[PDB]
């Protein structure tokens, strides 16, 4: 990322997540950082593999909710963090949709 | 830019707007159009709102609608009030169905 | 060094040098100004060293070889330009250029809209640039408080105002409420992150301190806090509400339930009941004061201690008696402090000795005593260091007294008035804004000393050199400050008296009637220069301006040499006229009479030195040449 | 180019660099950045210095004219210049210019006393400065990488000329550090022990380095004439205080040679490579 | 600079013009013993009359605070004396100068009281 | 700079250059431009220890008057960049403690205090005579510190329109080691004592009239060895009783008191190795707002 190495960055991240290792609360930040790559016009994006990423994300967030409450602190910013998380996954969906659009427009 | 301005003025005079809206364009042309029409009064604001919608520009249409509603808080023309109440109903109808970004903005306090 | 040989009736000592306006020529140091030895240090450090160079064996070589000169300065900002600029260009319009005497004078204008423009712009900037300072916030605070006590807002300018004393009191109070609404915004924004439904009673206390029932209720409902929401409306209900609470709490006292109930809701109850201090059966003093502002104290007093619709003054009176000694008893309210001082602790009442220790007050409170009564004694009003940590920037106090005059509150000594004018203009010196220090100064009515202060500042800042920046400065001073260029050209005259720019000494000494000096310059230098070098244009200009009979009547011996040279100029020029002509006998005869007259006046003067000898020699040789020329040309064909 | 042109150029360079560095009696301090130098500036300066050295060598009249120029004072100018820290190519040029100046004996004496006052290299080890600096450092870094070591030899010739023309009148009495012994140990150890230890792209360098050191030792020997009182006392009662006052540098250099000296060994070496 | 002890003729002439300048060059160039004498006859002339030798002109009978001389150089040299101690020869010279200054101070206070009666 | 203790440093009116007097019998003269500085000139011809040299008023040019022990009153002019002595006085018998200039208004005149217990006022025509007026037995014992009355004679309140020319008959003060600080007016062509003050039981060290800027209140700092510091004030010419106020009760001999130009702040030299910068606040009252070693 820091030198913006999109191709091999994404390939490594794909390999790492296919390896299926580490707690969920951090795969949060993982895909949070994966965001702008997903934004960038790239053809190597395999949306279906991105979506086992997201379905595991659903699985993990369900498990996280079952194991604990995301916010045990009541403050003006706890609901901010939550709604931010939903917005994040909404951004995931919308960006994936755009990536699919670009991939198709390039499959011409 | 001189060609663009001349076309805009003359096409405004002789009413070829729908014909013009049916062409291939460029980003610079639309950007200059937006810059020119932004500073040219309220009625041009609703016309360019129509143009946003004609090119399917609903987020920008809603931003322009918010700007117009904020502007119309000291205007007291009754025809403008009628049109603005219609516009408020219009935007309340449209924004809720659009993609979810403006829905989060609506969930946010105002 | 070490003085360790103290005898008695000793020798002499020393002093560093002063420099203009608290500049210092100093061999010693003030805070941290001078360095130790060695050029190389572990933590990447380099320092000086001179003294041990001549010796391979030190004898405490303590001798100075560079004395530094520094000028005391507060802050390091370079953006304060507009900060000082704007209020001063406000007095620009809220003042008038009294042109009385050659030196003008400035007097402010009683416009109270100056207050509004000041404070409104304070907010305007405070929003346009998010880089304002907390001190800027303090001064906006003072702005709003003064406006409230006298200024007129827009909510009662868009609504007709009514002269009944009760209307005035309630209108002052409602303006005070809108003020607190503006003030407590950031306080709410700060403790809102702090608190939650865990801290919900603390939020209750804050909301009560605000009188912010609206958003309190909105919070309680978004949280589904129905009982609390219902309590909220009761906070400012009828007096019967408080009768209810009095009897109800007397009951709880007989019931001892407090021991089983947290004093948290109990202080909520005290807030509702208007009871600031509770005396339990155990005589437990449950006081209401916490985290507050003295502002919040008196706001509570308004809303709750007496009718919330009551006036300003009596509520203030009760509050002051509350944090003061009542009957020799302990104060029970909050003792006002300036912001940087409640930064160092604050009080809620009791123990007047701990108030006696230092505990100064705030100046907006002084504003309040005035707005109430004019029997009050003013000796302490404007002193920004008492309300701000930093010493300088007398904008606050000085614009303040300006507004005081605009509001007829001119009721204190010109001693301190001109004192503040001078102090803030010296600040303008320190920063380099002398042509605005002028603006400051001309508000005193003492023409002589005012003229003085101007004179020495314009001697710091006369720039005889060509500069568009100088151009802008003089455009300002003459066109706007209406200062006669008389003063400016006196500046240039003395500056050239010291520096030597002929183009300026000539003009300005001639205007200043310095004829002997104009002699010993023009005659000594320019006369010889031009006669040798044939560049007589400028010279004839100066001789013509010298020839002014209004000058001449005060001039001595202008005839002796000055118009002498001038008539020689006339002779040669009309000879050149004769040269461009071919036949003019009635002009040749004029030239012949002039040359016969001048041939006997050439030699009476000149030869003050060898240079005078040269001048006389050239003069006599030229007059002989002109005489022979005219005699040859006046011959028959 | 002229004396006028080159001298105003130098004086402006120096005034700029004394604003970019501290005042006199210093080497370095935090200050505004120095003047920018182009390689063309370098070429012009070094070439003009070659010209100036040739001229002052061949013409004593030009040399005296330059030393007498009251409105240039290249003495104090070059003092400040060598106090300045720079790519030492030009510092070396300054040094060789001073060497060509010292040909005048009273100019040589002035240079001797001036340099002792300055302490360019390391003379007094009392703290109050960054000591232990100079050609030693730059030799450690740069000359080693280049494999070419001209400054060392140039400064060798510097002391050679200094001693042969000017003789010690004083060296220190609690005011300076008496004795050349500092730079003595310097030259013998740092160079005469280390000259053989160098890397050379071309072999020819070793020859001329060794000559630059041998000739210097020869002037030392040639000049030093012993005396019977050379054997008398080492501690001298400064006010009844027996203080160390090191023996004649001659005395010492002989006795070192008179017993086993690495000078013997390197003399040997010289012979075998010959 | 060439190691020359100052010639006596220059000593006498340039002292008979002025001496404290010589004093701070003693200081500058380690002329410490000789400065010590210069001080000794300074005090002695204070006691008597030798200002002529010093290039000084004031009539002398004794010493007082109202009479100027470089007490500063005096005390800086006392500094040099304090600093240059590693040996008992220096301590002896010190104690001698200390004694001299003590006799000075005692008679100085005598004359100072006499002046205080004025 | 110099190679000794520093007696007095004096800035030019431009604020670009320095006169600097030292015990070295020399005064160094430095222009200050950029980080570096240039000794444009050093001047010598001085005896004793140097006491003080004072700039006369700029309306006349570059003028410095120096007072020296060994009975030497040195009077230097600048010309062509060269500083030359236009006068000398001797005939005084004990060291002239201090010399002080009047502003342009009263002209080119310097008051001079002597350790003789006497005074001399020197008018100079500007190009002419050195008009000398000796005040014998000015103090019973030596004269320590003196102070003009700053610029024009009384009349500085709201007055008629500008360009007025009042009368010019002078006033001043001085305190001395007679334990007495007295005040004088130009009375009967003589100079007669307006007032005499014995409050400091000890010898007076320094006096300092505020070069007052726009205040009718005449205020003057007074320091002695007592440890008490008296600021003496009269709010107007009608205040015939000067008022003492303790700036501070130090415990040492306080030597120097010196306002600068605007008189806003005073520098105080005492037996403390430190000079203290005190000031009246906007509410008056002495605030020691700074402290500097020399």
Automatic annotation (TrEMBL), chain C:
Source organism superkingdom: Eukaryota
Q: State its location(s).
A: Nucleus membrane; Nucleus, Nuclear pore complex; Nucleus, Nucleoplasm
This chain's function reads: Plays a role in the nuclear pore complex (NPC) assembly and/or maintenance. NUP98 and NUP96 are involved in the bidirectional transport across the NPC. May anchor NUP153 and TPR to the NPC. In cooperation with DHX9, plays a role in transcription and alternative splicing activation of a subset of genes. Involved in the localization of DHX9 in discrete intranuclear foci (GLFG-body).
Sequence similarity: Belongs to the nucleoporin GLFG family.
Q: What is this protein called?
A: Nuclear pore complex protein Nup98-Nup96
What organism is listed for this UniProt entry? Xenopus tropicalis
Automatic annotation (TrEMBL), chain D:
Q: What domain of life is recorded for the organism?
A: Eukaryota
Q: Where is the signal peptide?
A: none
Q: Where in the cell is it found?
A: Nucleus
UniProt family annotation: Belongs to the NUP186/NUP192/NUP205 family.
Please identify the protein, giving its name as recorded: MGC83295 protein
Segment of the intact protein contained? 550 to 823 of 2011
From TrEMBL, chain F:
Q: Name one GO cellular component term.
A: COPII vesicle coat
Entry keywords, A to Z: Lysosome, mRNA transport, Nuclear pore complex, Nucleus, Protein transport, Repeat, Translocation, Transport, WD repeat
What PROSITE patterns does the entry give?
WD_REPEATS_2, WD_REPEATS_REGION
Location in the cell reads:
Lysosome membrane; Nucleus, Nuclear pore complex
Which positions, given as ranges, span the membrane? none
Q: Does the keyword Heme apply?
A: no
GO molecular function, a single term: structural molecule activity
Spans of the WD repeats are: 43-86, 197-232
GO process annotations (BP): COPII-coated vesicle budding; mRNA transport; positive regulation of TOR signaling; protein exit from endoplasmic reticulum; protein import into nucleus
Give one Pfam family. Answer: WD40
- What family name appears in the similarity comment? Belongs to the WD repeat SEC13 family.
Please describe the quaternary structure of this protein.
Answer: At the nuclear pore: component of the Y-shaped Nup107-160 subcomplex of the nuclear pore complex (NPC). The Nup107-160 subcomplex includes NUP160, NUP133, NUP107, NUP98, NUP85, NUP43, NUP37, SEH1 and SEC13. At the COPII coat complex: interacts with SEC31A and SEC31B. Interacts with SEC16A. Interacts with SEC16B. Component of the GATOR2 subcomplex, composed of MIOS, SEC13, SEH1L, WDR24 and WDR59. The GATOR2 complex interacts with CASTOR1 and CASTOR2; the interaction is negatively regulated by arginine.
Report the PANTHER family cross-referenced here: NUCLEAR PORE COMPLEX PROTEIN SEC13 / SEH1 FAMILY MEMBER, PROTEIN SEC13 HOMOLOG
* Protein name according to UniProt: Protein SEC13 homolog
Show the taxonomic lineage.
Eukaryota, Metazoa, Chordata, Craniata, Vertebrata
């Amino acid at each position: 990322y820091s030198q913006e190495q999109f191709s091999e960055a994404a390939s490594l991240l794909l390999s790492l997540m296919t390896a299926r290792i580490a707690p969920c609360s951090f795969w949060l930040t993982l895909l949070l950082d994966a965001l702008p790559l997903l934004e960038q016009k790239q053809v190597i994006f395999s949306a279906e593999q991105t979506y086992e990423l997201m379905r595991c994300l659903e699985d993990r967030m369900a498990a996280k909710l079952e194991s604990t409450s995301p916010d045990e602190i009541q403050k003006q910013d706890s609901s901010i963090d939550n709604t931010k998380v939903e917005m994040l996954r909404l951004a995931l969906a919308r960006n994936l949709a755009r990536a699919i659009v670009t991939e198709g427009a390039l499959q011409e | 830019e001189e060609l663009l301005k001349h076309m805009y003025e003359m096409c405004q005079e002789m009413g070829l707007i729908e014909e013009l809206l049916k062409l291939t364009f460029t980003d610079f042309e639309q950007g200059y159009l937006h810059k020119f029409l932004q500073t040219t009064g309220v009625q041009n604001q609703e016309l360019l709102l129509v143009h946003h919608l004609q090119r399917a520009n609903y987020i920008s249409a809603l931003q322009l609608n918010q700007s117009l509603k904020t502007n119309h808080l000291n205007d007291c023309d009754r025809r403008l009030r009628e049109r603005s109440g219609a516009r408020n109903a219009i935007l309340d109808q449209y924004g809720k169905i659009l993609p979810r970004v403006q829905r989060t903005l609506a969930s946010e306090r105002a | 060094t070490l003085m360790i040989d103290m005898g008695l009736f000793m020798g002499r000592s020393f002093r560093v040098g002063w420099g203009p306006n608290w500049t210092l020529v100093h061999n010693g140091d003030k805070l941290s100004e001078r360095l130790n030895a060695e050029e190389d240090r572990d933590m990447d450090t380099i320092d000086y060293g001179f003294l041990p160079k001549p010796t391979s064996a030190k004898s405490l070589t303590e001798s100075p070889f560079k004395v530094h000169v520094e000028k005391l300065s507060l802050e390091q900002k370079t953006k304060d330009l507009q900060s000082y600029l704007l209020p001063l260009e406000i007095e620009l319009k809220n003042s008038t250029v009294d042109k009385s005497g050659p030196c003008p004078h400035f007097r402010p204008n009683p416009g109270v809209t100056a207050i509004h423009d000041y404070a409104g712009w304070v907010r305007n900037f405070s929003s346009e640039a998010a880089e304002v300072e907390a001190v800027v916030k303090q001064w906006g605070l003072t702005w709003t408080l003064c406006e409230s006590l006298w200024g007129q807002l827009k909510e009662l300018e868009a609504s007709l105002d009514e002269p009944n004393e009760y209307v005035k009191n309630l209108e002052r109070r409602k303006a005070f409420s809108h003020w607190l609404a503006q003030t407590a915004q950031e306080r709410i924004e700060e403790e809102v992150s702090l608190y939650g439904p865990e801290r919900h009673i603390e939020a209750v206390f804050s909301y009560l301190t605000g009188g912010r029932i609206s958003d309190a209720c909105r919070l309680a409902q978004k949280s589904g806090d129905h009982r609390l929401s219902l309590l909220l409306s009761q906070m400012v209900g009828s007096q019967e509400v408080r009768d209810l609470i009095t009897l109800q709490l007397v009951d709880w006292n007989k019931l001892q339930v407090d021991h089983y109930i947290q004093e948290e809701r109990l202080r909520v109850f005290c807030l509702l009941s208007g009871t600031p201090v509770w005396r339990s059966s155990d005589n437990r003093s449950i006081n209401v004061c916490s985290q507050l502002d003295w502002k919040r104290t008196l706001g509570i007093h308004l809303w709750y201690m007496l009718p919330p619709t009551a006036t300003v003054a009596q509520a203030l009176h009760m509050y002051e008696q509350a944090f003061q000694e009542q009957e020799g008893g302990e104060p029970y309210a909050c003792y006002p402090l300036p912001p940087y001082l409640e930064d160092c602790g604050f009080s809620f009442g009791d123990d007047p000795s701990a108030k006696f220790i230092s505990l100064q007050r705030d100046v907006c409170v002084h504003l309040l005593k005035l707005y109430s009564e004019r029997q009050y004694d003013l000796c302490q009003l404007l002193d920004p260091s008492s309300a701000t940590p930093d010493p300088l920037d007398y904008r606050l106090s000085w614009h303040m007294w300006m507004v005081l005059q605009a509001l007829n509150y001119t009721h204190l000594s010109g001693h301190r008035q001109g004192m503040l004018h001078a102090s803030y203009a010296a600040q303008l010196e320190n920063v380099g804004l002398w042509e605005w220090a002028i603006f400051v100064l001309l508000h005193i009515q003492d023409p002589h000393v005012r003229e003085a202060a101007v004179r020495e500042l314009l001697n710091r800042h006369c720039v005889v050199h060509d500069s568009p920046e100088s151009l802008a400065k003089e455009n300002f001073l003459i066109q706007r400050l209406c200062l006669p260029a008389q003063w400016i050209h006196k500046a240039k005259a003395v500056r050239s008296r010291r520096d030597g720019d002929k183009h300026k000494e000539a003009l300005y000494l001639l205007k200043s009637h310095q004829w002997n000096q104009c002699h010993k310059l023009v005659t000594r230098h320019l006369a010889a220069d031009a006669v040798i070098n044939e560049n007589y244009r400028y010279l004839r200009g100066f001789l013509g301006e010298l020839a002014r009979p209004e000058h001449c009547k005060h001039i001595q011996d202008w005839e002796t040499a000055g118009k002498v040279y001038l008539d020689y100029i006339s002779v040669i020029e009309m000879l050149n006229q004769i040269r461009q002509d071919e036949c003019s006998g009635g002009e040749l005869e004029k030239l012949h009479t002039k040359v016969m007259s001048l041939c006997k006046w050439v030699e009476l003067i000149q030869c003050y030195s060898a240079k005078g000898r040269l001048a006389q020699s050239e003069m006599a040789k030229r007059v002989a040449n002109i005489l022979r020329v005219v005699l040859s040309l006046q011959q028959p064909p | 180019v002229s004396w006028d042109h080159f001298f105003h150029s130098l004086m402006l360079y120096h005034e700029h660099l004394r604003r970019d560095l501290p005042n006199t009696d210093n080497i370095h301090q935090r200050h505004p950045p120095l003047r920018g130098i182009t390689q063309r500036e370098l070429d012009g300066l070094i070439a003009c210095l070659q010209l100036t050295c040739t001229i002052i060598d061949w013409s004593e009249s030009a040399r005296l004219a330059l030393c007498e120029h009251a409105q240039w004072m290249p003495v104090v100018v070059i003092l400040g210049l060598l106090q300045c820290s720079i790519p030492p190519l030009l510092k070396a040029e300054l040094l060789k210019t001073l060497a060509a100046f010292g040909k005048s004996p009273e100019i040589a004496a002035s240079l001797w006393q001036s340099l002792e006052y300055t302490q360019i290299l390391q003379t007094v080890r009392a703290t109050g400065l960054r000591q232990g600096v100079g050609i030693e450092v730059e030799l450690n870094e740069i000359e080693s990488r280049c494999e070419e070591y001209p400054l060392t030899r140039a400064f060798c010739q510097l002391i050679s000329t200094l001693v042969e023309s000017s003789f010690p009148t004083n060296l220190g009495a609690g005011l300076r550090a008496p004795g050349f012994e500092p730079y003595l140990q310097f030259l013998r150890d740092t160079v005469f022990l280390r000259y053989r230890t160098r890397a050379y792209r071309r072999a020819a360098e070793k020859w001329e380095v060794a000559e630059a050191v041998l000739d210097v030792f020869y002037k030392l020997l040639k000049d030093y004439e012993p005396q019977p009182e050379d054997f008398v006392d080492q501690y001298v009662e400064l006010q009844g205080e027996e203080r160390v006052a090191f023996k004649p540098p001659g005395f010492s250099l002989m006795h070192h040679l008179l017993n086993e000296s690495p000078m013997l060994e390197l003399c040997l070496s010289l012979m075998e490579e010959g | 600079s060439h190691g020359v002890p100052l010639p006596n003729w220059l000593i006498n002439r340039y002292k008979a013009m002025d001496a404290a300048e010589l004093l701070r060059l003693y200081l500058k160039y380690d002329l410490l013993e000789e400065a010590a004498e210069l001080v000794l006859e300074y005090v002695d002339a204070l006691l008597g009359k030798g200002h002529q030798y010093f290039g000084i002109q004031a009539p002398l009978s004794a010493t007082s605070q109202l009479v100027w001389f470089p007490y500063s150089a005096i005390d800086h040299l006392r500094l040099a004396l304090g600093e240059n101690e590693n040996n008992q020869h220096n301590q002896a010279i010190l104690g001698k100068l200390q004694r001299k200054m003590d006799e000075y101070f005692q008679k100085l206070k005598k004359a100072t009281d006499d002046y205080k009666k004025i | 700079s110099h190679e000794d203790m520093i007696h007095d440093a004096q800035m030019d009116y431009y604020g670009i250059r320095l006169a600097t007097c030292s015990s070295d019998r020399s005064v160094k003269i430095f222009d200050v431009k950029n980080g570096g500085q240039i000794l444009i000139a050093d001047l010598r011809g001085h005896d004793g220890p140097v006491w003080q040299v004072a700039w006369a008023h700029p309306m006349y040019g570059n003028i410095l008057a120096s007072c020296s022990y060994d009975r030497k009153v040195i009077i230097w002019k600048e010309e062509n960049g060269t500083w030359e002595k236009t006068y000398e006085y001797t005939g005084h018998d004990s060291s002239v403690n201090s010399v002080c200039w009047a502003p342009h208004d009263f002209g080119l005149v310097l008051a001079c205090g002597s350790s003789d217990g006497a005074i001399s006022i020197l008018t100079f025509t500007g190009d002419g005579p050195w008009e000398v007026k000796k005040i014998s037995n000015a103090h019973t014992i030596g004269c320590n510190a003196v102070s003009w009355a700053p610029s024009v004679i009384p009349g500085s309140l709201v007055d008629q329109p500008s360009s007025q020319k009042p009368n010019y008959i002078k006033r001043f003060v001085s305190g001395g080691c007679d334990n007495l600080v007295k005040i004088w007016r130009e009375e009967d062509g003589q100079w007669k004592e307006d007032q005499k003050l014995e409050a400091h039981s000890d010898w007076v060290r320094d006096v300092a009239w505020a070069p007052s800027i726009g205040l009718p209140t005449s205020t003057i700092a007074s320091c002695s060895q007592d440890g008490r510091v008296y600021i003496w004030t009269s709010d107007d010419a009608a205040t015939n009783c000067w008022t003492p106020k303790l700036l501070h009760k130090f415990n040492d001999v306080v030597w120097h008191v010196s306002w600068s130009i605007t008189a806003n702040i005073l520098a105080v030299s005492g037996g403390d190795n430190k000079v203290t910068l005190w000031k009246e606040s906007v509410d008056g009252q002495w605030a020691c707002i700074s402290d500097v070693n020399k």
